[PDB]
Paper text:
Transcription of the ribosomal RNA (rRNA) precursor by RNA polymerase (Pol) I is a prerequisite for the biosynthesis of ribosomes in all known eukaryotes. Here, we use single particle cryo-EM to solve the structure of Pol I from Schizosaccharomyces pombe (Sp) in a monomeric (apo) and an actively elongating form at high resolution, showing that Pol I cleft contraction upon transcription activation is common to both organisms. The architecture of Sc and Sp Pol I is similar, despite poor overall sequence identity. Nevertheless, we conclude that the principles underlying Pol I regulation ‘activation by contraction’ and ‘hibernation by dimerization’ are conserved among organisms.
Pol I subunit A43 does not contain a connector element in Sp and therefore should be unable to form dimers, as inferred from connector deletions in Sc16. Taken together, we concluded that reversible, connector-independent dimerization of Sp Pol I is possible. A three-dimensional reconstruction of Sp Pol I dimers at 4.5 Å resolution was obtained in C2 symmetry. Unambiguous placement of two Sp Pol I monomers and rigid body fitting of subdomains yielded a model of the Sp Pol I dimer. Whereas establishment of Pol I dimers depends on stalk-insertion into the cleft of a second monomer in Sc, the Sp dimers form by interaction of the stalk with the protrusion domain of subunit A135 in the other monomer. A second interface forms between the ‘dock domain’ in subunit A190 of one monomer (including the Sp specific insertion of residues 580–587 and the Pol I specific helix α12a) with the wall subdomain of subunit A135, subunit AC40 and the common subunit Rpb12 of the second monomer. These two interfaces allow a tight association via the establishment of contacts between both Pol I upstream-faces independent of the connector element but utilizing organism-specific regions. Low-resolution density on the lobe of subunit A135 in both molecules in the dimers may indicate the presence of A49/A34.5. Further cleft expansion in Sc Pol I dimers likely results from mutual stalk-cleft insertion and is not observed in Sp Pol I dimers. Despite this divergence, functional importance is apparently conserved: Both molecules in a dimer are likely unable to initiate transcription since binding of the initiation factor Rrn3 to the stalk-dock region is blocked by the neighboring monomer.
Residue numbers in the entry:
A (entry chain P): 12 to 34, 44 to 59
B (entry chain M): 1 to 97
C (entry chain M): 1642 to 1681
D (entry chain R): 61 to 142
E (entry chain J): 1 to 68
F (entry chain M): 484 to 724
G (entry chain C): 117 to 232
H (entry chain N): 1029 to 1046, 1054 to 1120, 1128 to 1174
Amino acid sequence: RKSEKLDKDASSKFLNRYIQTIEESVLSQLNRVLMYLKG
Amino acid sequence: MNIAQPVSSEIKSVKFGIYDVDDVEKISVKQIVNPVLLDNLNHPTNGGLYDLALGPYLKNSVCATCHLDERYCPGHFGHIVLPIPAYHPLFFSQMYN
Amino acid sequence: CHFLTEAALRGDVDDLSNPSSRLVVGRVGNFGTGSFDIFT
Amino acid sequence: GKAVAKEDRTTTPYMTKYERARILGTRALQISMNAPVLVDLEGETDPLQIAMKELAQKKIPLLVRRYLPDGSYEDWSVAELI
Amino acid sequence: MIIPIRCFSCGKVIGDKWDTYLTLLQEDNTEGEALDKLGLQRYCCRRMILTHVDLIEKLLCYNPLSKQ
Amino acid sequence: VNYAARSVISPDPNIETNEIGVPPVFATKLTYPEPVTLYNFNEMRNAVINGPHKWPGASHIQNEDGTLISLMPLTIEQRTALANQLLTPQSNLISSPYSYSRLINTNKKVYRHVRNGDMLILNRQPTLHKPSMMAHKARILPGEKTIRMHYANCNSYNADFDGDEMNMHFPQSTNARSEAQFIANTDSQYLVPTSGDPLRGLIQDHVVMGVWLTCKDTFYTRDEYQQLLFQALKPDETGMY
Amino acid sequence: DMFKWFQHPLPGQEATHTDYDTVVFSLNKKCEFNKNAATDEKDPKRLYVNSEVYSGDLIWKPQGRQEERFADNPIRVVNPDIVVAKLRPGQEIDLEAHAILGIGQDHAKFSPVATA
Amino acid sequence: FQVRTTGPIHNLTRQPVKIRFGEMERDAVIGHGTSFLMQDRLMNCSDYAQSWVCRDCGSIISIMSTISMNGVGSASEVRCRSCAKTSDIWQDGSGKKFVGGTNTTLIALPSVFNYLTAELTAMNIKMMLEVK
Amino acid sequence: YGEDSLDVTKQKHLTQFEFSAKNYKSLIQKYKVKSVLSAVDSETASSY
Amino acid sequence: TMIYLCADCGARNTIQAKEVIRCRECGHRVMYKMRTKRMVQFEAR
Amino acid sequence: GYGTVYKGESFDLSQKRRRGEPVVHHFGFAPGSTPRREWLQKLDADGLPFIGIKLEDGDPIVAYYDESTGQNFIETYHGTEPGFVDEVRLLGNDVGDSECQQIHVKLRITRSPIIGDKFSSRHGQKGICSQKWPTVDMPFTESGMQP
Amino acid sequence: DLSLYKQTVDLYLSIAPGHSRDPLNAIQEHMDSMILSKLPRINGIVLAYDNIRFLEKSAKVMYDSPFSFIWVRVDVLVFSPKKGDCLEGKINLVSPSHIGLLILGIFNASIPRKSIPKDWIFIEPDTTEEQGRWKTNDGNILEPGKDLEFVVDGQGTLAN
Ligand SMILES: [Zn+2]
Ligand SMILES: [Zn+2]
Ligand SMILES: [Zn+2]
Ligand SMILES: [Zn+2]
């Protein structure tokens, strides 16, 4: 149990990576948070 | 005894030790002050010796403390106070010596 | 009562050695098949 | 504490009279709880004896740990024990 | 609901003959007498696949377990 | 404790030195849990078919979540339906309770009666030394209402077979029953711990007629020899041969 | 003719089956939504898979010696083509059928001849 | 002749009410060196129970299931009173707000031991059993 | 322990030199020499 | 708990006794009970 | 002609909350004891019956218990013919923030053509199902289909 | 702000016996359960997890449960809105008793009128009674201002 520092771009790239690794509704709201963060 | 249980702990060591007055305050949930046990209503008097915050009574009562029936409430202790303090009768000889 | 109060004063810690103290805490004893552990 | 290195192992290379017992116990448990069997069945139904057929060929996972009273312990694969 | 197999009057089973007769009016340009190609010599087991209402294809569009 | 009967004993020479013959009553009133796999599926299903009032029927069901469906009130129709669906994913969620999904991998636990391969503990009060409490194989006998075992166990339990009853225990899990089956099985208690002297073995009648028969003055035609050899063997009740 | 009559079970009725009396079939279908659909064509035969529970989906389940006694003549529904019910994404039907010998004047389904 | 698969449990200690196994039999099973059998017959078949403990304070009674956090939501995550003092905080059956006492685990142990802890707390003497 | 060899159970025939030497062929396979001799040391202690 | 069906959204809700009743994903306030597997037997008449 | 009746009843707990107390009853069983001889066979666990289970007259339909008393009450099937249950409905009592105080059971009753029921062509020519003659004792055309 | 958090935690996972061939299987099996479900150990909601590696201990099996246990290291993506500082959301429902906002298109916010400064006023339309504009004190209208920035108390606050 421990924490580390992070910023938003690595969070976005990691979320992308996470959509990539694991392959429903979970992934749907993930798509939602994705199109929310970007642009 | 169920094979599907995931119990992950391990009791590693038991250690004894007396508890002070302060810790009894933190754990206890209630205090009994009324020597009355039951009312004409046949019901546990609040703050009384059958306090439903001490635990769920039978006849399908829910604990006032844990808000669950008697199947799942592990019972929650209470405390009764006295500004006397008299010595502890087990350590009596050791205390006096 | 006696051993009880005596252990209460000092507060000596057994880990748990005899399979009897093992037994009062429900865990298996340290003897027999219960001495060793099996893995994956 | 420490884990004893595989190179230096003083515990008896023999399958103790107790070790076989506990091993077969858990192997029956796994198999009974829908675990993969690494030996062909011969029509066998008791989930437990099946583990006997498994041990008889020593085709079995679930290495064992032998704890020295000091605090060290050995890790013996079932295929490595006698 | 569904086309009632084993017609009342006749003893002929007809439940098979529904989509096979539907795609006769549908694309064969022949009128209802395409059932004559089906082999319903009588009128009894004949008047079923003729004037049967297949309401269930409209009832089935009512799954509350449509997940949508 | 639970799952432990208590009955009067009478010996029997037919059964085994290992197995204990049990009346069907206990086989009904003593049941233990069992996960169901694909290959043991037919056995368990059959036991569930037989029902809770006919050996080797099954007691009742426990769901993977942990609940416990009984089997006395049902009819054999409902039994049949429950049995056919005794092995299937019935949990109506990947983890019905919360986000702790190990329940997808559990099985339906069938509580089944005891049968001819079961290991059930025997004991006697007072139990002085470890051969005074051992593990026996189960064989279910029909008819009698009294637990039967072989003489050769008389000596180890030292019981006089006058009425002195016994405690009859049954391990729940698989590891405990395997352990009783291998370490403390009656067959593994032949040399007492005090000295190496074996205590289990034959008694007055066996030693007597053994003396008589063994004497060189004896003779047998083919009929007697075959009948006697088979009579002792009876491999089928044991198998393996 | 290869069968023996069913003794209708009077009270005390449960255990009145055998393998020389009756036969059992089964079916179980859950219409899954088919994902290979291009667009909206409410056929729905191609929009969904197993939307129609036919008669060809009542599989005979042998009962012991039956499997052998009819190994020369495997028993089936004589019309494997009838549509029995219709299904859609999500729902399911699961059951098994018990068939015996019966005489027409008891039930019409027992009358074998379509028209005499 | 008395069979008992199960039945009534005691008022106080949840024991099958008044077959005897132990205190000489224990010598027997441990003579065979058959631990799992012992823990099976005397702990499992007799009184098996799950109870929480405060991992830090090491007490077994200062535990309590949290109360009325939100709707049915997630589980009522038990907490400790002795180790205590928006999501973290919670309330009491009487309404006393609190916080902390999070480090809580679930352990198997015979309920008769729980009774012992009860009547020993009745003496102000209590053990602080830790866990790993 | 207690002259380690073992409690009475498997030390009853240690004294029975003759009966061991009598057959020894059931026994040599019962002990499964081909496996034992693999992983164990023999000559050091036999020499000492 | 009990498992129900949000009428419109069509989403399993897993609600428990003595609880506010509504769809968790869309907010609907009407829900049916799913049909468990329960042995029922019928005659063919 | 296969008659199928839908008799739909609702149950509501507010009516038995006359005054003086808040909402007290809740559908299901008071935690603890529960009659099995009928109830658990019909009522699923929620005090609500199984979906599609056959009922009879003297048969519980739904179960609510009082909070204070902690005792289970029951509702029987007034009707006097075997009826099943096609669906049960948990009515959100209000805008929200309300326990399920209304339930709706839709019972399906089967009415095949029975002796004593009425038929009529579209000319007012009403008739009555008298005997359901055996299909073989019926006359037939030269084609043979029976009337 | 930087309300996003990734934290490599170590857990005591319960490996099923049937997945004894590969632990990663049963690990991800329930790891897909933690996603989007609050990990209370850290008090946040799982958003992502990778680096599924176990401290190799050839997992010790329970004494009587065939499913074993092992420590595994994985990296979570909890989002911690612990009343830190200014965050922002898209308004979805607006009515003069509280305002409903969506943060990150998922999570909800009910800022009541009391945590809102009294100076802002609501307009109750003709087509809709409650679906209307909580026009600010400035008079700026808030629906097309779908984004509202605010501070969190745990639950939101608009009072300054
Ligand atoms: Zn409580
Ligand atoms: Zn016709
Ligand atoms: Zn604490
Ligand atoms: Zn909804």
